[PDB]
From a paper:
Several TCRs have been isolated from TILs of epithelial cancer patients that recognize a neoepitope corresponding to residues 168–176 of p53R175H. This neoepitope includes the arginine-to-histidine mutation at position 175 (HMTEVVRHC). The structures reveal how oligoclonal TCRs 12-6, 38-10, and 1a2 discriminate between wild-type and mutated p53, and demonstrate that there are multiple distinct solutions to recognizing the p53R175H neoepitope with sufficient affinity to mediate tumor cell killing.
To assess ligand-induced conformational changes in the TCRs, we determined the structures of 12-6 and 1a2 in unbound form to 2.36 and 1.83 Å resolution, respectively (TCR 38-10 did not crystallize). Superposition of the VαVβ domains of free 12-6 onto those of 12-6 in complex with p53R175H–HLA-A2 revealed structural differences in the CDR3 loops. Whereas conformational adjustments in CDR3β were restricted mainly to shifts in side-chain orientation, CDR3α underwent a large movement (r.m.s.d. in α-carbon positions of 3.7 Å for residues 93–97), which allowed CDR3α Gly94 to hydrogen bond with P4 Glu and Arg65H, CDR3α Tyr95 to hydrogen bond with CDR3β Leu97 and contact the HLA-A2 α1 helix, and CDR3α Gln96 to hydrogen bond with Arg65H. CDR3α Tyr95 showed the largest individual displacement (6.5 Å in its α-carbon position).
Author numbering:
A (entry chain B): 3 to 39, 42 to 244
B (entry chain A): 2 to 125, 130 to 146, 148 to 178, 181 to 200
Amino acid sequence: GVTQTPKFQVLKTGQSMTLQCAQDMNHNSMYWYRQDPGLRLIYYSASEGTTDKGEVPNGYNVSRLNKREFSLRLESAAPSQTSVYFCASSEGLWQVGDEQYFGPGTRLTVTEDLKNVFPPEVAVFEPSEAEISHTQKATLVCLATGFYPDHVELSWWVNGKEVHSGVCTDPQPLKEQPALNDSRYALSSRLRVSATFWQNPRNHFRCQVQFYGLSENDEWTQDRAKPVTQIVSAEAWGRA
Amino acid sequence: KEVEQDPGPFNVPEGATVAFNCTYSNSASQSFFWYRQDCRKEPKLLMSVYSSGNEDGRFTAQLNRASQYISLLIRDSKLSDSATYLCVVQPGGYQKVTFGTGTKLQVIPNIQNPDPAVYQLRDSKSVCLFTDFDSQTNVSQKDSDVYITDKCVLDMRSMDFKSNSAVAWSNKFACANAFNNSIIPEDTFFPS
């Protein structure tokens, strides 16, 4: 329906960037919103040839290129523009009952220094023997720790297949230092299986954290590894 | 900023009925919508709202133009209904559409056989797992070197079994003391 690129982005203060948005629904009207911990209209485009400021236009620019595409531009990013950005479209904002379809959104983080970006450390913690004895069930825990920005996706893979049954992931990464603006984050998930499942040594449990970070384009001078968009996994094996 | 909705968040037992209400100031308002938004995701149309009343399955919506409110009724709540529900108003004339701040819904399952326990798990150093506690136990946030997660529901579908858990960990520390700021039921299992 409504596509947005990129889905994730970390910028240095003062850098520029454009968020791209496309609808294949032949709508006239398109919008750009930001959402902060609701929705505020940045700018809108009522039809192909025109654009107009929304509630919070300061710091942004937009092109209505063609009927199909509506770009949002951040001239020079400021920390305050850290936010979730949603593109939307509608058949025509002048009609009674006009319905808006949202794009998936773009989580954008602005920091003073790209040295604050870190991929997650990932570890799998094995079921307690006491849990296994008491319940005849076994709960694994995956921890992703030390990452920034909080742009991660966690999934569980058992024997080469992605699983949802028995899985709980925290809705939200928590801040390791809630006071700090550059706090690094942590995310936990559980995966619970039967005792006999865990006790099969052939069973393979893999926690997979997708991290989104710096692009290839971004410049790195720090002694440590360039914190790029990457996947990190941690693994466990069954034990009788 | 002139649509006002339920503050929230709202806890509703699984299967029970949930009710949402929203007021709007502009009585010349033309169109009305309920949107639903999952955590870390985008808003989605749930339904249009008419004076007629409106029913799709478990969802009923009502507009009352005389009194300036809209409503949403959800029967037979599912765990999958957990989300934020945004009131949405299209004024139609000189103003932009307004989206409400939203009311957060958390549909809570019944745990028939609480088995509250705190287990310690080792790295394939260690974390603490509080689990199998009933849905009305509350897990609290106090130590800055102790990390405590909110309550999370997992669903072992093949066994038709739900259970709550919370994870805690620290660099400083024993599981016995990890969840003290929560009212932990006495007889919570603490393994040898």
